[PDB]
């Protein structure tokens, strides 16, 4: 459904928020087949596994050469750097306490920094993530006894203090 917003339902994933964007993070072993969807990763690209996901924003693709072959290729507009698909315009962008993403406000594809919570781009530091600044959580955490929480530099819906994830139903329940 186009761009990821606070209303997006991450299929088999969950919303995380940084200083400049929101994205879906996948569960357990799953990988992003699109910006909203997570599915099982395939280990070997073959004639049988074509079109299937083999990594975040990476799919097994048929190469129509002589002979035909198969490879795990990043989606259009991305390139494999450090065994992860990143936008072509972020290839040589070092953001520091953050990650490089495509600036949605610039009609020409451009790389900008989205920062860990507590940081924002710093014009004095080549627009890196080294300026202390507040980012108010925009997530609508409406599930049972859940609230927005900063965890490892990202905002995420998690159990309120005093509650834990029930091991049967995967809902937040009182510790006991």
């Amino acid at each position, epitope marked *: 459904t186009g761009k990821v917003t606070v209303d997006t339902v991450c299929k088999r994933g969950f919303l995380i928020q940084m200083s400049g964007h929101l994205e879906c993070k996948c569960e357990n072993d799953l990988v992003l087949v699109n910006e909203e969807t997570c599915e099982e990763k395939v280990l070997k690209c073959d004639e049988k596994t*074509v*079109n299937k996901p083999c990594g975040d924003f990476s*799919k*097994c*693709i*048929k*190469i*129509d*050469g*002589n*002979p*035909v*072959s198969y*490879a795990c*290729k990043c*989606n*259009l507009g991305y*390139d494999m750097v450090n065994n992860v698909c990143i936008p*072509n315009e972020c*290839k*040589q962008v070092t953001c520091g306490n953050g990650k490089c993403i495509l600036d949605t406000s610039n009609p020409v594809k451009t790389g900008v920094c989205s920062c860990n919570i507590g940081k924002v781009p710093n014009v004095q530091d080549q627009n890196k993530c080294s300026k202390d600044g507040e980012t108010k959580c925009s997530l609508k955490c409406l599930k049972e006894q859940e609230t927005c929480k900063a965890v490892d530099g990202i905002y995420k819906c998690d159990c309120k203090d005093g509650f834990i994830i029930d091991q049967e139903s995967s809902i937040c329940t009182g510790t006991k």
Partner: single-chain antibody
Amino acid sequence: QITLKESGPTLVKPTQTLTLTCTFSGSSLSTSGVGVGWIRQPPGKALEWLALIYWNDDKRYSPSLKRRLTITKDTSKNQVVLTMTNMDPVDTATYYCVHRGSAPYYYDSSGYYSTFYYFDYWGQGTLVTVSSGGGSQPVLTQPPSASASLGASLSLTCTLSSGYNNYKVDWYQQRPGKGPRFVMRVGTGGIVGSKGDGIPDRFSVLGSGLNRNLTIKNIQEDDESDYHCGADHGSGSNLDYVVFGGGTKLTVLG
């Protein structure tokens, strides 16, 4: 667009070494590209692939000219350099710097997410004059010449040799006085991927068995040109070698 500018000496004396340089702009390290190479053409004759260097510093050379060829790259200066030893008058040719990139992703007949690698951008080339002083490979057969009237329709043919009925070929259009440009790739069915930039909708391709046809419809004056078909032999980015046909010269009557 990716611009390729050839530079180097244009007059060489026999037995000397030729050193051509190519300066590329619009690509850095696999930003919609996998390599940069060289293709030459003796005046009025068939294209001949020479060498290729990948961005992983891998190299490929023409099997028959390997002992004479060296290719290097200096990414800091956006340059690749070809070196050809023991030059001979028959080596008189226009030398084209070429970029090998990947076709925009497409869905084929069976709905299979697909792409391919091809020589998608060509430099204008430089004419090097040398003063006086291959088994079990595909063979591409093209008729030497063709002719058509203005507004007519025509099918140029490119036939594969036996045992190569699954191979896809690329068509290249070389308007006179200008260098080749990619037109379309065609295999056993219809168009493979999409047509090159600047290629008008009046062009289409259809293949069956060993035949690979390029059809030009509503033939205008600017279709008068040499039409070359080539075939890449290699699995993936890989490129063992490249075959070319003799080329067809299309004359537009009227």
